[PDB]
Amino acid sequence: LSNKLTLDKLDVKGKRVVMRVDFNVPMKNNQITNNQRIKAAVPSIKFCLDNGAKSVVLMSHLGRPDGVPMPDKYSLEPVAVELKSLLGKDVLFLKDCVGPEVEKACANPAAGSVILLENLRFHVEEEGKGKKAEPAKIEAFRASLSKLGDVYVNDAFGTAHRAHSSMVGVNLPQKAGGFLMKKELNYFAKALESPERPFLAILGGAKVADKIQLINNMLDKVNEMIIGGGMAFTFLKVLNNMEIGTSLFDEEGAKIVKDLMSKAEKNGVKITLPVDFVTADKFDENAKTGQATVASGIPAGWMGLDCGPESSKKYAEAVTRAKQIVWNGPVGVFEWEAFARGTKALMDEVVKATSRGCITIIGGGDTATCCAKWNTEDKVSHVSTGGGASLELLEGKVLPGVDALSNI
């Protein structure tokens, strides 16, 4: 951020601040399971208010509603309630993010107003595709967001990899990175400069279509990679002709698996895949469960929702060899206890590693919730609010949300 405008150099006195944040917080039974991402934005929000901002208008997405309004499942309303306790100020929650009446509400608010807009992704123009969007409308969407502030701050580190309207398309003459964006980028700048070696990446989770496309570049930076969670099944099917049942599978990524493995071998990156699994007869917390190995396959209609004990042992071995680890993506559906064991065991290994001097970086909306859940946040080196975003830094990329900031 050395030659970008940052919030500490932005005169906010008397100005309306429109601020992109990543409030894409994990949810369960309609409740926030982890407020980490919300707390992370507080220092930027408090700075603005203490320095005389007229208002702070917060905007974020939540989940992947893909351009349809879905307040029943994906409203940011519960975040507004949560933001209130963290700030010690009230926050006006609006039921849309654009335009006429949202614009009226943000036009000239009372001094010190904090306002939270509804889920950006209820409009197709944020991404702007979903379930296919028109440029003229994309332009209008962006103009509307731009009206909501006099100056713009992006503190959405967790979303910085996304060139979406709210992240790269706000037209104000001052576009500054917030304090969370700064802290996260500075930390990674340091950690990624000359990583300790062996440098292990651990990649799991459920965003297979996306994160499988990050491995190619990551293979030029790391010495080992665990590929677990939902990611593993695409690899195992292509390499070992493993039956995977209805486990997560990416058709596109399946096509590049052999290329990735060739590059890994060429670059001397040891790939550790799982060898066994906890299976489930359906995608439900209370599914009937089973056990499978790669050799046995996962039966018809069942899905692998955790790795098994032999996989945990292989994972622990890779972690024992590491002097630096970057972990994004739980290695099972850890939100459900029947499938939490693999992620819990890896966490124990990562904490042990930290205690003997391994530099351990855990990132992502869901992966950082693993830390909250098992109370390891102070027991690893760094818990980042970015998952995908952190993996794109490891790739060596400039993040679109940082790139779109004003130059000093």
Ligand SMILES: Nc1ncnc2c1ncn2[C@@H]1O[C@H](COP(=O)(O)OP(=O)(O)OP(=O)(O)O)[C@@H](O)[C@H]1O
């Ligand atoms: N084997 C699996 N099958 C299905 N889902 C899985 C499996 N393993 C893990 N998951 C799911 O992975 C999801 C997380 O994937 P995701 O990429 O969103 O991770 P994340 O930590 O939030 O990263 P990000 O910060 O970039 O969003 C979790 O909800 C978990 O339930």
Ligand SMILES: O=C(OP(=O)(O)O)[C@H](O)COP(=O)(O)O
């Ligand atoms: O949670 C997010 O990334 P993460 O699951 O990789 O941590 C970001 O909020 C962006 O969400 P997205 O992957 O739906 O664009």
Ligand SMILES: [Mg+2]
């Ligand atoms: Mg996630």
